[PDB]
Design a protein around this nucleic acid. Structure first.
Length: 215
RNA sequence: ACACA
RNA sequence: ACACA
């Protein structure tokens, strides 16, 4: 139905600031479709390359975030000319252990299953944000002290509810700008939850909201 | 802005 | 403890 990119690979630039990393960049556009792998490059003062399902994931990433503002800087996006990303040697990152990472086996892929694709929803970016896999008492109190500990600006509005699951909470958030919700997406997605007596943490997840409000 | 793959 | 109030 929809159009597709000219390559299974994608290119991004403007990653000069220390706030960018392969985990943060790749999950931001991962909410837009199925992904494969990501790779950083030393050949520029701040750039990287990505491999994804090119139809829906590289089209929508180029439709919604490519050269949008983030962290007080820009994250340029456009199509690659490479045939595919190759693993091998690396040099590490300022916020990562390797210049390379893999997601082809990750559950983070939102379109990887028919039980997700039947209820999935996608829209243009906004200052509104949605979350799932969050504590029952996560509200403005846990959202405020978590963002302030990471040095990130806290949201301007918060909402939390139930009935979506009995295992974990869900709700909406909002910021004073679209780039403010996007930079907080980079720092809070896949973040580990705390537990009062649990044997291990479980990760929180978030993405651009389609809700009608955040309060 | 297209790799110590 | 994987996706829209």
């Amino acid at each position: 139905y929809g159009p597709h990119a000219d390559s299974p690979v994608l290119m991004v630039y403007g990653l000069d600031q220390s706030k960018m990393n392969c985990d943060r960049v790749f999950n931001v556009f991962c909410l837009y479709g199925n992904v494969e792998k990501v790779k950083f490059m030393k050949s520029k003062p701040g750039a990287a390359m990505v491999e994804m399902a090119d139809g829906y994931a590289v089209d929508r990433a180029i439709t919604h975030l490519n050269n949008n503002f983030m962290f007080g800087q820009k994250m340029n996006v456009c199509v690659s000319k490479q045939p595919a990303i190759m693993p091998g040697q690396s040099y590490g990152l300022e916020d990562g252990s390797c210049s390379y990472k893999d997601f082809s086996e990750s559950r983070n892929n939102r379109f990887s299953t028919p039980e997700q694709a039947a209820k999935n929803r996608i829209q243009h970016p906004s200052n509104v944000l949605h979350f799932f896999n969050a504590p029952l008492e996560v509200t403005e109190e846990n959202f405020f002290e978590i963002c302030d500990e990471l040095g990130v600006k806290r949201p301007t509005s918060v909402k939390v509810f139930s009935g979506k699951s009995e295992r974990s909470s869900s709700g909406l958030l909002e910021w004073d700008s679209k780039s403010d919700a996007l930079e907080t997406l980079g720092f809070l997605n896949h973040y580990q939850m705390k537990n009062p007596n649990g044997p291990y943490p479980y990760t929180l997840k978030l993405c651009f909201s389609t809700a009608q409000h955040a309060s």
